[PDB]
Amino acid sequence: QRCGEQGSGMECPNNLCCSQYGYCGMGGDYCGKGCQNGACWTSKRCGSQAGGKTCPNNHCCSQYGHCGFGAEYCGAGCQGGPCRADIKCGSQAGGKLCPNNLCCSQWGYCGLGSEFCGEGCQNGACSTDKPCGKDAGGRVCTNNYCCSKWGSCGIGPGYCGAGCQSGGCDG
Amino acid sequence: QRCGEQGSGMECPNNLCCSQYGYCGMGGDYCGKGCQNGACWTSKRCGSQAGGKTCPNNHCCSQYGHCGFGAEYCGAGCQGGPCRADIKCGSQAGGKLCPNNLCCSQWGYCGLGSEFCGEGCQNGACSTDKPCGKDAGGRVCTNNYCCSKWGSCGIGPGYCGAGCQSGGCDG
Ligand SMILES: CC(=O)N[C@H]1[C@H](OC[C@H]2O[C@@H](O[C@H]3[C@H](O)[C@@H](O)[C@H](O)O[C@@H]3CO)[C@H](O)[C@@H](O)[C@H]2O)O[C@H](CO)[C@@H](O)[C@@H]1O
Ligand SMILES: CC(=O)N[C@H]1[C@H](OC[C@H]2O[C@@H](O[C@H]3[C@H](O)[C@@H](O)[C@H](O)O[C@@H]3CO)[C@H](O)[C@@H](O)[C@H]2O)O[C@H](CO)[C@@H](O)[C@@H]1O
Secondary structure: OOOHHHHOOOEOHHHOEEOOOOOEEEOHHHHOOOOOOOOOOOOOEOHHHHOOOOOHHHOEEOOOOEEEEOHHHHOOOOOEOOOOOOOEOEHHHOOEOOHHHOEEOOOOEEEEOHHHHOOOOOOOOOOOOOOOEOOOOOEOOOOOOEEOOOOOEEEOHHHHOOOOOEOOOOO | OOOEHHHOOEEOHHHOEEOOOOOEEEOHHHHOOOOOEOOOOOOOEOEHHHOOEOOHHHOEEOOOOEEEEOHHHHOOOOOEOOOOOOOEOEHHHOOEOOHHHOEEOOOOEEEEOHHHHOOOOOOOOOOOOOOOEHHHOOEOOOOOOEEOOOOOEEEOHHHHOOOOOEOOOOO
8 A cells, every 4th residue: 555665665546646655645745845756746757867766656757858748748758668769679670678668569669468469569568468488488578577487487576486497586 | 456346446567467356366267257346358338238337447438339449449439438539527518527536627528537537527536626515605525425524525444434414425
């Protein structure tokens, strides 16, 4: 239920602002001073102008490095988030990965749903579930995901714990 | 640190899958059966198809009522979320309010950032706190937000509890 640092990076539903103390709400108490994520009155920096950091809550990063929605943020110059432009990736783009765990279609563009994560998916939250490791001819996961003992890619102690074949192993 | 139901409608950062058990991670144990939000393998339903339902994590609802990202989703047809087309609202669109607490600009389009939430903001998460209640001519807030004791609009205990002048007051 807590959010921000007090909630492990958690986000509030419906763009609700996460107060500096880690609770979800709307109003100055949450959206004002110390706002962690959500519709912060005080807009979060991103991309080029902010060390490459991405926007939380899947907001778009304007050409100016500010987080939000609308033509201004998602239109021309958008550096991140659901940009109105099509985001290239995969072999077709220097082997690039999609941002914020987006899947890369076989056609070389970023997205989510069966058309992007389905078959041909190059990276991101692909739902194909290709095996990795000892039995996959030594295959390693994409996105530094952890290859578990059963030889599946994922993130969470069950994938990254002891017996973590490769990737972001805790162990 | 719980997501979905077990964490009060809370969502994971970076489109991480909220498991049936309320924990964030990626993989089948998270993104497969039971997934409550995030980049679930079997995409969430929305729109007119699912009773008017919005998409979690600010995903787009395609014309067919499935949640995701990419041309197919946010492109033509888009029913909700950060569509490619501009979302009209306010007095221009029949006093229509923006979805997901988005701000309705002075011009009749939804968004987040100083441009939609500042001067002229019509509904949604405006950063401007127009006073409500007794000391405001008995003005009421937009979106059924709670007019608080001290005379401010917001959501959360402080605003909707004891001294809630109007709105989504509980007590
Ligand atoms: C979309 C976006 O990221 N807006 C930022 C804003 O952008 C910084 C640049 O602003 C340009 O001027 C904007 C101005 O801010 C708007 O109010 C106006 O309506 O449109 C013009 C378009 O150019 C300047 O040209 C440029 O020098 C930058 O300053 O910055 C503010 C904070 O400064 C931010 O809150 C907002 O999200
Ligand atoms: C954008 C969207 O909502 N996609 C839905 C899809 O929507 C109905 C249409 O499905 C098309 O089929 C998909 C196919 O399932 C994808 O895997 C493939 O890569 O692309 C096509 C085109 O989007 C039909 O061709 C079209 O006529 C519509 O009926 O429905 C599917 C379930 O059928 C859903 O999984 C997908 O997320």
